[PDB]
């Protein structure tokens, strides 16, 4: 697996600055990449 995408996913999962839609949007973005 790609370590970079896994790291980004985990950060977004636990990012205190985001609400659910913002978190969902960010994770969706990460998923599109690698």
């Amino acid at each position: 697996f790609n370590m970079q995408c896994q790291r980004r996913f985990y950060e977004a999962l636990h990012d205190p600055n985001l609400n659910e839609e913002q978190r969902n949007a960010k994770i969706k973005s990460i998923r599109d990449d690698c």
Partner: protein, 207 residues
């Protein structure tokens, strides 16, 4: 009439962003006479329409089997959303409902220990490398082995076992040629769990 079973996603699928986790609703004992089956899916009480439903399959006992698959968001499953499958069939007087979600309770980080082969086993052509994973909750976990930046395939893992303190443990066993072990090659036990940083950790083992 018919019977319904609802199954969770695979542990690795919920933890790795490169994978696609799904919940599976299975309907058994569907008759030849009333083969039409209807699925309504709900996520925390909200109806969703993106399920993928397969055509009926006839079974060895002459009943039909029908399956519906709902893809779920990683973060939704991990954050404890409830998934409900509601099945309608005319043979049923009223619809059947099943609900599942991630196990509740405080997550606990797995402790990972690697154990070399016994001195007794060094009389063999092949030897066993052991990975002990303990103290974790919930029981959803995945384990893999690698060496020299390549996956090792000759391993087997026990299912999770409930420990005395309410946490779980398991063992994973990798079998290798004794000569590779003695060569000083480094082997790594990879563990994936929601309580780990990045859902991933690795422990090494060598002579």
């Amino acid at each position: 009439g018919p019977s319904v079973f609802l199954f969770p996603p695979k542990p690795k699928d919920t933890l790795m962003i490169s994978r696609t986790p799904e919940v599976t609703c299975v309907v058994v004992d569907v008759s030849h006479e009333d083969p039409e089956v209807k699925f309504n899916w709900y996520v925390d009480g909200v109806e969703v329409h993106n399920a993928k439903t397969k055509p009926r399959e006839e079974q060895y006992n002459s009943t039909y089997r029908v399956v519906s698959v709902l893809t779920v968001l990683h973060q939704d499953w991990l954050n404890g959303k409830e998934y409900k499958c509601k099945v309608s069939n005319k043979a049923l007087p009223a619809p059947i409902e099943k609900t599942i979600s991630k196990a509740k309770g405080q997550p606990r980080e797995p402790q990972v220990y690697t154990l070399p082969p016994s001195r007794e086993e060094m009389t063999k052509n092949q030897v066993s490398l052991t990975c002990l994973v303990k103290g974790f909750y919930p029981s959803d976990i995945a384990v893999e082995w690698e060496s020299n930046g390549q996956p090792e395939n000759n391993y087997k893992t026990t299912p999770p076992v409930l420990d005395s303190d309410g946490s779980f443990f398991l063992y994973s066993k990798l079998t290798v040629d004794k000569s590779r072990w003695q060569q000083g090659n480094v082997f790594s036990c990879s563990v994936m769990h929601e309580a780990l940083h990045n859902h991933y950790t690795q422990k090494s083992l060598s002579l």
